[PDB]
């Protein structure tokens, strides 16, 4: 990690992809990234909402802003979106995996279809994008940024499929970080553990069932960008203070030393 | 609190029961006088296991062969097994897709197969079995690993699938508490075990102390009989000590009333 204080200029001229960027934290990240003079390529499914975002980005001072629309249910699209984004920017420094299949609050009864879709979109596609991007990311000694959640560190009811997929990201990407450590690949992996953030999709899905405070999505977004710029292993963000301090697991840090050899 | 008589006449399914810990588990069940239905892809080996379970004092022993890459087989395998045994008390999810030790190298197929077999089939099996278990106030036992709790290199796809199990099955465990479904869920976090397949995979690259699979198998069954939420089993007691996660227990307890 960059033993250093975050500077907005760290992101100037940086060639950055942001997925699920048509709303919520994805949008806000893209805007922040634009104000810092980044080249931004964004994706999502709705081209309409995507274009609007691209408008707002160019004004803000984005060195370049582009969009590509498609669904990450389709892995062939996943792959091509990254090569195409590479084109539009002339390389890739930071890859921001953020999109998720749309979810709500339910007791799991029989939806094996929602479980697979969550696994494919929330997780597998992240792996596809990662493979697509790794080449460019090695040359630029860039960064992968992976947005996760409290539900991907601890267990909560009514978010089973979602939690499995976030847990799966932890498992896969943490495991990959260590491989890059051994094989000396200089590409940072940052896992971001977000508590409730006030996106319009979250507050819609939380209404009635859950009473808890939502942290701003604007600071949430900056915080994720900083964690990746500074190449941290993990980032925690949550309105509370209780929360953010327990997330770190030193005993885990301890056992991961058994391999060291 | 545990005593072998707990599993006498209990109806039990063991998956991946043709080799390693799965075979050992079926054998313990047989001694204990359980009704057992076992599975794997190979009928030849399942046959050998079934006759052995009988010699060991099994109240009943039968195999059903098929691949858990097929969610239709998985889902019918449970219907068929349950109807055979007249019900079901315990479901022991244990099988995995063939895995070896290598650096992730763009092999997305392996990552997906691992999610399919290691994680998703466990869910289909569970859905299929839930009505019978609700009826018997039975139990689901999920066999996981250290890589399902912590990050290691050379096991990326595998860890992903096992982490998946923890996040999914712990989440549903909370759900049953609250919807008063009396079906226990046990996650078993096992370090290295001396199964032929583990031993062939983990060498001669490195090697730590392998605990014995007969012990492991039994601790898994015990964990399940006693309805515990997690079971840890490793060669080193220092390792077992470090597996537990109190911060998590608190974050889940805190946000327990958070609310409804
Ligand atoms: N906000 C929170 O309370 C909270 C809490 C914990 C974790 N997180 C994490 O934060 C991240 C963003 O959350 P959010 O609430 O901001 O998300 P969101 O508002 O629901 O939107 C995420 C984006 O993903 C896109 N998307 C949906 N399906 C897609 C698909 N099949 N292929 C490609 N893109 C797709 C959506 O755009 P389209 O509909 O146009 O496709 C959307 O822009 C997620 O990774 C989430 O897990 C958020
Ligand atoms: N042994 C260890 O060092 C270790 C460490 C940590 C965790 N674990 C956990 O312990 C459990 C058992 O491990 P193990 O070492 O005992 O495994 P194993 O003996 O090598 O084999 C597991 C079983 O799964 C079956 N199987 C393979 N592919 C299948 C498929 N596609 N569909 C249905 N069944 C299939 C195999 O039978 P067929 O080939 O005939 O299909 C076999 O009976 C696993 O969940 C593993 O994650 C083991
Ligand atoms: C309920 C929220 C938002 N959610 C989310 C995000 C984006 C969406 F689009 C939809 C959702 C969801 F709510 F429907 F799941 C994902 C899951 N979580 S979370 O991990 O941020 C979380 C935070 C705090 C607590 C707590 N009780 O302290 C519990 C949880 Cl699960
Ligand atoms: C290597 C073993 C056995 N393995 C396994 C089991 C059954 C199989 F069939 C195949 C494998 C595998 F090794 F090939 F993945 C699954 C993964 N693990 S483990 O999680 O028990 C483990 C134990 C100790 C260390 C450590 N070095 O401190 C690391 C790990 Cl990942």
Peptide bond into A87 cis (omega under 30): no
Instruction: Give the residue carrying structure tokens 């002339």.
Output: A90
State whether B167 and A157 contact (CB < 8 Å).
Answer: no
Neighbours of A232 (CB within 10 A): 18
Whole-angstrom distance, CA of residue A133 vs CA of residue A195: 28
Q: In what order do the strands lie in the sheet with B184-190?
A: B60-65, B35-40, B11-14, B90-93, B139-145, B184-190, B230-233
Instruction: Give the residue carrying structure tokens 């601790």.
Output: B219
3-class DSSP state for residue A75? helix
**Bridge partners of B13?**
B37, B91
Method by which the coordinates were obtained: X-ray
For residue B246, what are the contacts with CB-CB under 8 A and spacing of at least 6?
A: none
The DSSP element (H or E) to which B14 belongs, if any, is: strand B11-14
Tokens representing B49? 């296991």
Whole-angstrom distance, CA of residue B56 vs CA of residue B52: 6
The string over A69-100, giving b where at least 16 C-beta atoms fall within 10 Å of a residue's C-beta and e elsewhere, is bbebeebebbbebbebbbebbeebbbbbbbbb
Whole-angstrom distance, CA of residue B168 vs CA of residue B140: 13
Strands (E), A81-233: 94-97, 143-149, 188-194
Cα four-point dihedral sign B144, A232, A75, A184: negative
3-class DSSP state for residue A194? strand
- Burial (CB count within 10 angstroms: exposed 0-12, middle 13-18, buried 19+), residue B257: exposed
Whole-angstrom distance, CA of residue A134 vs CA of residue A95: 9
Residue among A58, A45, A130, A127 nearest A92 (CA): A130
Q: Tell me the H-state helices in chain B.
A: 20-31, 43-55, 71-85, 108-114, 121-136, 156-178, 196-201, 213-225, 237-243, 246-254
- Burial (CB count within 10 angstroms: exposed 0-12, middle 13-18, buried 19+), residue B66: middle
Contacts of B149 in chain A (CB under 8 A): 252
Answer for the pair A143, A122: CB distance below 8 angstroms, yes or no. Answer: no
The string over B230-244, giving b where at least 16 C-beta atoms fall within 10 Å of a residue's C-beta and e elsewhere, is bbbbbbeeebeebbe
Q: In what order do the strands lie in the sheet with A94-97?
A: A64-69, A39-44, A15-18, A94-97, A143-149, A188-194, A234-237
DSSP string computed for A77-112: HHHHHHHHHHHHHTS-SEEEE-----------SS-H
Tokens representing B253? 């307890």
List all residues of chain B from 11 to 50 with a beta carbon under 8 Å from chain A.
none
Whole-angstrom distance, CA of residue B83 vs CA of residue A107: 27
Whole-angstrom distance, CA of residue A38 vs CA of residue A30: 9
Answer for the pair A42, A20: CB distance below 8 angstroms, yes or no. Answer: no
Is residue B20 lining ligand 2, measured as CB closer than 6 Å?
yes
Instruction: Give the residue carrying structure tokens 């796809």.
Output: B157
Number of inter-chain CB pairs under 8 A, A vs B = 182
Whole-angstrom distance, CA of residue B213 vs CA of residue B225: 18
Is residue B116 lining ligand 2, measured as CB closer than 6 Å?
no
Distances (CA, A) of A243 to A202, B138, B183, B208, B247: 18, 35, 30, 36, 10
Tokens representing A128? 């596809």
For residue A228, what are the contacts with CB-CB under 8 A and spacing of at least 6?
A: A94, A96, A143, A144, A145, A188, A190
Backbone angles phi, psi at B218, to 5 degrees: -65, -40
Whole-angstrom distance, CA of residue A147 vs CA of residue A190: 8
Answer for the pair A43, A70: CB distance below 8 angstroms, yes or no. Answer: yes
Go through the domains of chain A in sequence order and give each one's CATH number. 1-261 (3.40.50.720)
Neighbours of B181 (CB within 10 A): 16
For residue A157, what are the contacts with CB-CB under 8 A and spacing of at least 6?
A: A107, B171, B172, B174, B175, B177, B178
Whole-angstrom distance, CA of residue B32 vs CA of residue B26: 10
* Ligand located closest to B207 CA: 4
Ligand 4 pocket: which of B113, B114, B201, B233 to mutate (most atoms within 8 A of CB): B201
Tokens representing B162? 């096992």
Does the annotation count A162 as an active-site position? yes
- Burial (CB count within 10 angstroms: exposed 0-12, middle 13-18, buried 19+), residue A171: buried
Neighbours of B91 (CB within 10 A): 30
Is residue A259 lining ligand 4, measured as CB closer than 6 Å?
yes
Q: How far is B84 from chain A (nearest CA, A)?
A: 24
Instruction: Give the residue carrying structure tokens 């390792």.
Output: B239
Cite the active site residues of B: 158
Whole-angstrom distance, CA of residue B30 vs CA of residue B4: 11
- Entry field: residues in chain A: 261
- Residue A207 falls in which region: left (phi positive, over 0), alpha (psi -120 to 50) or beta: beta
Answer for the pair B171, A160: CB distance below 8 angstroms, yes or no. Answer: yes
3-class DSSP state for residue B131? helix
Whole-angstrom distance, CA of residue A14 vs CA of residue A141: 12
The string over A183-205, giving b where at least 16 C-beta atoms fall within 10 Å of a residue's C-beta and e elsewhere, is eebebbbbbbbbbbbbbebbeeb
Whole-angstrom distance, CA of residue B129 vs CA of residue B111: 26
Tokens representing A75? 């892995």
Whole-angstrom distance, CA of residue A72 vs CA of residue A91: 21
**Bridge partners of A194?**
A149, A237
Q: Which of B124, B151, B165, B245 to mutate to test the interface with A (most CBs of A within 10 A)?
A: B151
Q: What angle do CA A237, A35, A230 make, to 5 degrees?
A: 45
Is residue B40 lining ligand 2, measured as CB closer than 6 Å?
yes
Report the atom number in ligand 1 closest to the C-alpha of A49.
Answer: 40
- Burial (CB count within 10 angstroms: exposed 0-12, middle 13-18, buried 19+), residue A251: middle
Residue among B185, B193, B141 nearest A108 (CA): B185
What's this structure's resolution in Å?
Answer: 2.2
For residue B18, what are the contacts with CB-CB under 8 A and spacing of at least 6?
A: B38, B39, B40, B41, B42, B45, B46, B49
- Chain B residue with minimum CA distance to A158: B175
Answer for the pair B239, A255: CB distance below 8 angstroms, yes or no. Answer: yes
Backbone angles phi, psi at A63, to 5 degrees: -55, -25
Distances (CA, A) of A72 to A103, A171, B113, B167: 15, 20, 18, 22
State whether A252 and B165 contact (CB < 8 Å).
Answer: no
Distances (CA, A) of B197 to B32, B112, B163, B235: 26, 21, 21, 17
Q: What angle do CA B248, B253, B258 make, to 5 degrees?
A: 120
Answer for the pair A97, A166: CB distance below 8 angstroms, yes or no. Answer: no
């Amino acid at each position: 990690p960059l033993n250093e204080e975050f500077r907005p200029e760290m992101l100037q001229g940086k060639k950055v992809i942001v997925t699920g960027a048509s709303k919520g934290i994805g949008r806000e990240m893209a805007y922040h990234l634009a104000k810092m003079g980044a080249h931004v390529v964004v994706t999502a499914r709705s081209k309409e909402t995507l274009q609007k975002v691209v408008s707002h980005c160019l004004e803000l001072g984005a060195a370049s802003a582009h969009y590509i629309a498609g669904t990450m249910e389709d892995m062939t699209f996943a792959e091509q979106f990254v090569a195409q984004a590479g084109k539009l920017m002339g390389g890739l420094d930071m890859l921001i995996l953020n999109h998720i299949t749309n979810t709500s609050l339910n007791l799991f009864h029989d939806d094996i279809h929602h479980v697979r879709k969550s696994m494919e979109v929330n997780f597998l596609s992240y792996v596809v994008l990662t493979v697509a991007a790794l080449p460019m990311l090695k040359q630029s000694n860039g960064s992968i940024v992976v947005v996760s959640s409290l539900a991907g560190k601890v267990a909560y009811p009514m978010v089973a499929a979602y939690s499995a997929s976030k847990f799966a990201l932890d498992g896969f990407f943490s495991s990959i970080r260590k491989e890059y450590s051994v094989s000396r690949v200089n590409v940072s992996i940052t896992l971001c553990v977000l508590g409730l953030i006030d996106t319009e999709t979250a507050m819609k899905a939380v209404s009635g069932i859950v009473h808890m405070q939502a942290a701003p999505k604007e600071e949430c977004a900056l915080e994720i960008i900083k964690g990746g710029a500074l190449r941290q292993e993990e980032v925690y963000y949550d309105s509370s203070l209780w929360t953010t301090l327990l997330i770190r697991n030193p005993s885990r840090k301890i056992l991961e030393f058994l391999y060291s050899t």
